[PDB]
Design a protein around this nucleic acid. Sequence first.
RNA 1: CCUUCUCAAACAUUCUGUUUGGUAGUGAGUGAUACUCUUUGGAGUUAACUUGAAAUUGCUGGCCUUUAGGCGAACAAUGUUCUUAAA
Lengths: 247, 54, 133, 260, 168, 153
Amino acid sequence: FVRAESIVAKTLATSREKERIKRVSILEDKKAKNETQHIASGKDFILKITEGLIREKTTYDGKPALLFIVRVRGPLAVNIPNKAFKILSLLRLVETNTGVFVKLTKNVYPLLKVIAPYVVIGKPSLSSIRSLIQKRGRIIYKGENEAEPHEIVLNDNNIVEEQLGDHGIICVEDIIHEIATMGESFSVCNFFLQPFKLNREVSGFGSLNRLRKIKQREAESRTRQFSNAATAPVIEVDIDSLLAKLN
Amino acid sequence: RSQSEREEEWLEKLYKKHGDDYKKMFFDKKLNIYQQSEGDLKRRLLRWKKRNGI
Amino acid sequence: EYSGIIYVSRLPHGFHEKELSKYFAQFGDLKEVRLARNKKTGNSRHYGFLEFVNKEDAMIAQESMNNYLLMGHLLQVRVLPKGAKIEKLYKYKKRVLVEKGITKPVKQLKDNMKQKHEERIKKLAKSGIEFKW
Amino acid sequence: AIPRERVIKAVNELIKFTSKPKNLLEDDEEELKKDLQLIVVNNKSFTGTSKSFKLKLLNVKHSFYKPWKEASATAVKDFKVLLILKDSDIKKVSEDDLFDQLDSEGIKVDEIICGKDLKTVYKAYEARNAFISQFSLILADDSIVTSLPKLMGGKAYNKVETTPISIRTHANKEFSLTTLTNNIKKVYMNQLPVKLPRGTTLNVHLGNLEWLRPEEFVDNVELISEQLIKAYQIRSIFIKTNRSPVLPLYYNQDVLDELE
Amino acid sequence: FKFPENIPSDVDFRIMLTFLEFYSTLLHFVLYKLYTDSGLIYPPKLDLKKDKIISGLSSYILESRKYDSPVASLFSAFVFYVSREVPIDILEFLILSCGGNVISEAAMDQIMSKVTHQIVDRPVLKNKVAGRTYIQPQWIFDCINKGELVPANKYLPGEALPPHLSPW
Amino acid sequence: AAETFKLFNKYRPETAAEKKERLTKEAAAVAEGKSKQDASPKPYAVKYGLNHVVALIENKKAKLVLIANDVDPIELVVFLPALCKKMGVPYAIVKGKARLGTLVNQKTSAVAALTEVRAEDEAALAKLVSTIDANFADKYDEVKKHWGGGILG
RNA sequence: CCUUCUCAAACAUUCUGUUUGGUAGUGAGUGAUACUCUUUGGAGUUAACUUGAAAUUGCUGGCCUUUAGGCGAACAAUGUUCUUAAA
């Protein structure tokens, strides 16, 4: 017997989120078609939340890079539209606690303004990326005799060179290496290491962990800022300390 | 019977903020938050002046 | 006696007929649902009308919502009497502007400007305090 | 340009017009309306094909806010100055910091308000409208300016005093109190607000006749009007009292040929 | 080995966590006596950017405040070039047990004068430098089990290897 | 009752720990001295002492009163609906004095008066008053006069 | 039972200046003087006031797309589908 309040508060949340994605689409069509005379900021910006918490702003880089996006649990009571759902579904970020590797360019970048209230962005370290891949990771795999929806964790390097002998990718240490590299092939690793899973960070219910939930909700309310301005700076957080928690 | 250092410093703030007049310092919000009585102000200031600053 | 048609006042912002349907369907199936909206901009006038399959279900729904505090201001629901019917509501959108060309050519309306200027001068005479221009 | 002589003719005509005469103790608001100057500009396509809540600040020779304030001391509604600043901005800026700068040139900020205060203390239409209606001069940081219209209410954007004014504390990366200090001077006494509605009609408010000198009125009007001509293609100019009928001073007949 | 393991639902952690915490505190104070007995500081400092290269023992710098022959300082003054192909961890630790240096190109792409030896396990070797010695890693696994040097013709790719049976 | 609790949890009184903590902060400030300023608007909180609750009536100062249904000496309480009735105070009978004690850091409270409200909350206060007077004073007023119970078990 | 675009660029050094861009609204009601077209269908603008977010039916703009969306973005577009805020 659903509620009378959430049905209205979610409707306001849909109005806000759909309108900010509308304003994003307007301003990005103005930047992309270069019919620009009336915008706020010509170039985009990258904000950096680190430790009373400092936030460093650097102008955008016209250069491809590695990112490890982290699907966050979204904000409180929002029904999310179809444009954001299309971008998240092309990036496989439904069923949260899934941080996935992605490429920074200028054409992939306008998606990052749209997914930003639902994910977090940042630069991870190759030791942390290493520990992610060597501790976590599934492979959808075609094997000996299966109905074949099956995923194996990263054990066999010969299974790796079996499907990736064409690109010449062997020995998952090299998959870590060339996710770091992105000079020959990175999206092949997106096809191969296609699934990802992270743990839920708090034990959750119960007294000793509800305090932890409250403190970390205060931490998340500090670290995440919601812009809704369509000139939204990209917010990077250190994934390196973050994977001391989530891996 | 002398005066305490905080409240004589408070009187010293009042002595420089308003001067000597009492109707202005009576209706002062800042540094008269206890809203002292009209003449208690006079008594404490005269005691403070006899103690220090003529 | 009372009908199944229902008046609801004091609606919160962004709370529309879809949400009215999705909520009041849980009371029972409803016949019709409308919101009083504004013409230039399709915004709520904060009152609307419900209709149910039953009058008894309408009264049950009206009881649990008549002094209902909700999202700020409280709500007030009243069933209508048996002699009451729904009339004249429409989901108005935001009506955007239209631009249509001036029909007269530029020299006809130059002449219209010249006529209206002299005419306003004649009005400044007619009102009238002196104005040589 | 515009024949200044004709403007002096029209303003003396309007002085003669307002000089024409159970009564109220407290005088009619309409009686206060029938003494005031408003500039009306017919101009081709004054839309930007979009709503423009931003006010243009026109550089004006004279400052009507000081005779406003001097008559406002006699008047019932008292002239008040509102600034809306950031949270960190209010944390840094204090009131004596403003008051010392403003007593140098002899003005006064009434109040300073955070957007937090708009979104929780006055998050109620009655209290918000009552709080806004106290004020004549409303200033806001340019960063906050484009965040305002959900917080301000459209009843604030209906009138000219109630709509806020863009002003900047920043000149570098951070703000400087010098920038806000001379910037409130610029916006106060050297600039006049301009609403930018749709249609072909522009209404510009000047002010009551009793406040300024009539040739000073003429000088301010001609300066503003030349600024407008250099700004926009203008059909005509009618200046008047909102009780009075219009007064045709200047018009360009070829603008309408140039539209199409 | 550092592989993602399927977790067993059969086990209960509630015992192994108690063993964990007990062994953690016990080994903690034993590391205290071994660090103070070795005369250096018990908290080991690490450069953060060295940890960002690799999360290993080589992340830690070890302060101040001979080696037993032959296994300690076996391969003295010896410069390795471990590949990106090899498992970096246990070979890194063996070279650190030797005292030689570690150069891996996997560490390099985070961002070669003295390198003489490649530990690599690949069929086709690209640059095929005759100055640099090409060796499959069992040579390190067999040299330290003997304490002594052996010829690397078996350890040259792609020669087959003796079935290693360790000294047990 | 849910929105009433959402209201009064905005106006929780200060605990003894939070009190002593702020005291130690300002006392360490004066101990350095470092006499920072002399400024604090007022504390606003719920009022919960029973004689204090009655004391806030007969001025009147009580904007809202919550009254627990269950008190074992009921006679402590029985005049309060008629007293707020004649004084015109918007009383409401709440269910459970433990829920009163939770919002006031006591075991039980059995009364809950609220007088002073910030300007952010004052508009919510008036509509809550109108809500209660619609939901309580209109619904239950005539049946209040009737002899309850009497039906056997 | 949610929380609202809390800055951009250019020039210049003046211990901070100068220019430009960046803002869709709470509903209802009163009402001055007018302006502009549209081809009578009115449309779009213009002073000022009221109101506890108050509340009772103003009958069906146009154009375009898909099976609802844009006109403040045209090969423009959109859905209500996130679970340790559980049970």
